DNA sequence: CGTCGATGACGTCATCGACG
DNA sequence: CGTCGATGACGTCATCGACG
């Protein structure tokens, strides 16, 4: 009955927006957290040229 | 006019969701450009653990 | 071939801060 | 107070591939 079947529908349209949402608040916690992981990658890099400077002599 | 309001508003939502996908796409390039600085910087700091290591 | 759930695309409403 | 553009939340339509 198409009655019903729209009725399904906007069922279906509600938890697709919400997995839209989801994935896009993923999406923004990917970049905090990569963007965390360089910090962290740069600083140890430069921890890294300071024992290559001790070594240095 | 509220027919023009509406028409007006049918607009308005045409580049507002043109702005989100927008928005979406620059989520998308920024987690892979900062994937491939994070491959730089891991790599990197091998070389300098290399370095490091020439050192002994 | 008829139907299903997922989705992209779209128009409409409600609501907001800003402007005068 | 009316009005404006932007935008979040919806419901609807068209279309998909999958199923039987």
Redesign the interface.
């Known amino acids: 009955k198409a009655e019903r079947k729209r009725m399904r529908n906007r069922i279906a349209a509600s938890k697709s927006r919400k997995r839209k949402l989801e994935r896009?608040a993923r999406?923004?916690e990917?970049?905090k957290t990569?963007?965390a992981?360089?910090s962290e990658?740069?600083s140890?890099?430069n921890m890294?040229?300071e024992?290559?400077a001790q070594?240095?002599q």
């Open positions: 896009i999406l923004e990917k970049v990569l963007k992981q360089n990658l740069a140890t890099a890294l040229r024992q290559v070594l240095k």
